[PDB]
Amino acid sequence: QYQVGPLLGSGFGSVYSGIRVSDNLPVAIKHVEKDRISDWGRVPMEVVLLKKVSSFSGVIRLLDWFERPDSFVLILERPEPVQDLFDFITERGALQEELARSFFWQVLEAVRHCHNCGVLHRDIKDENILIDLNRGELKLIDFGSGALLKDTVYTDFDGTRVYSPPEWIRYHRYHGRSAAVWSLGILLYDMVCGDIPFEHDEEIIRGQVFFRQRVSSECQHLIRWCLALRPSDRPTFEEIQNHPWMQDVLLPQETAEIHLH
Ligand SMILES: COc1cc(/C=C2\S/C(=N\c3ccccc3Cl)NC2=O)ccc1O
């Protein structure tokens, strides 16, 4: 069936590079131990969520999955060549606003897709975004801490803390969309400054954003908006994409030729 390659990453489980014997298609082989899965639907919720979002290249595609005695094995698409946003920023530093605009736009489109399919990702960050270097397209990955999207309150969280909103830190309560917008705020800052704005709980609670890089006023505005302390003061996905800084986004293909080649 599949031919296993080198380990791509380890945590939310372990993920290996792979080739599908059928057609030599590049795939990724994810291994998740059953004893670590707290959410089921009988398969892990991660499988359910991935199936709901299959269609559109902004979200990672689930090609197949297998059940083993103690683990589940996920077969996911693998772009070639590819690099994740964390490594991309780590090696290249703070991104240019034009490039950050293109990336952030693609992520917004991706999360908007997840929501239409009734899925909440709950771990939006640089590490969970892959870059198809050739096509200039971004993919959202690792739905392992995500949930079915609801309009009521969430009292559980198992995503990245430094990307989590102050209402989570304070009260252990959040609503899906406003919380997503907050993490998007952290992400956009990460893109334009080369690092995340908050490290400790108290910084998150305070929500005072400092820019360590020359960033345009409009970008700072959008960032400070997504990072509003009160969830209700945060912009909606529509409000973000109608923001003046999001005007005139590049096509993914232009983005590659200008910024990736
Ligand atoms: C990591 O690189 C790739 C990931 C994916 C899909 C992945 S990787 C993932 N979770 C992890 C993240 C970091 C460490 C360990 C795990 Cl299990 N979840 C996915 O859907 C594809 C193609 C790739 O080239």
Q: Are 164 and 200 in contact (CB under 8 A)?
A: no
* Residue of 88, 141, 160 best suited for mutating to test ligand 1, as the one with most atoms within 8 Å of CB: 141
The number of CA neighbours under 13 Å toward the Cβ of 88 is 26
> Computed from CA positions of residues 65, 142, 86, 241, in that sequence, does the dihedral angle turn out positive or negative?
positive
Q: How far apart are CA 231 and CA 92, in angstroms?
A: 32
Q: What angle do CA 223, 224, 227 make, to 5 degrees?
A: 90
Residue 82 Cα to ligand 1 midpoint, Å, equals 11
Q: Are strands 14-20 and 2-10 parallel, antiparallel or unpaired?
A: antiparallel
Largest CA distance in the chain: 55
44: Cα within 13 Å, side-chain hemisphere? 27
Please state, in angstroms and rounded to a whole number, the distance separating the CA atoms of residues 50 and 72: 14
Domain chopping of the chain, boundaries: 1-80, 81-261
CATH T-level assignment (fold) for domain 1-80: Phosphorylase Kinase; domain 1 (3.30.200)
Domain 81-261 has CATH 1.20.1250.20: no
Catalytic residue annotation: 123
173 CA from centroid of ligand 1 (Å): 28
> Are 129 and 140 a contacting pair, CB within 8 Å?
yes
Kindly write down the DSSP assignment for every residue of the chain, as one continuous string.
Answer: -EEEEEEEEE---EEEEEEETTTTEEEEEEEEEGGG---B---BHHHHHHHHT---TTB--EEEEEE-SSEEEEEEE--SSEEEHHHHHHHH-SPPHHHHHHHHHHHHHHHHHHHHTTEE----SGGGEEEETTTTEEEE---TT-EE--SS-B----S-GGGS-HHHHHHS-B-HHHHHHHHHHHHHHHHHHSS-S--SHHHHHH-----SS---HHHHHHHHHHT-SSGGGSPPHHHHHTSGGGTTPPPHHHHHHHHT-
Question: Cβ(28) to ligand 1 under 6 A?
Answer: yes
Distance CA 155, CA 172 (A): 6
Using an 8 Å Cβ cutoff, are 58 and 109 in contact?
A: yes
Q: Are 65 and 47 in contact (CB under 8 A)?
A: yes
- CB contact set of 99 (below 8 Å; sequence gap of 6+): 255, 258, 259
Q: Tokens representing 99?
A: 């490039």
CA 82 to chain centre: 15
Ligand 1 pocket check for 8: Cβ under 6 Å: yes
User: Which are the contacts of 68, defined by CB distance < 8 A and separation ≥ 6?
Assistant: none
Structure tokens at 228: 């509003």
CA atoms of 110 and 113, how far apart (whole Å): 5
Residue of 133, 173, 132, 179 lying closest to 160 (CA atoms): 179
Ligand 1 nearest-atom number relative to CA 32: 17
Kindly state if the Cβ of 16 falls inside 6 Å of ligand 1. no
Whether the CA torsion 97, 210, 221, 136 is positive or negative: it is positive
Method: X-ray
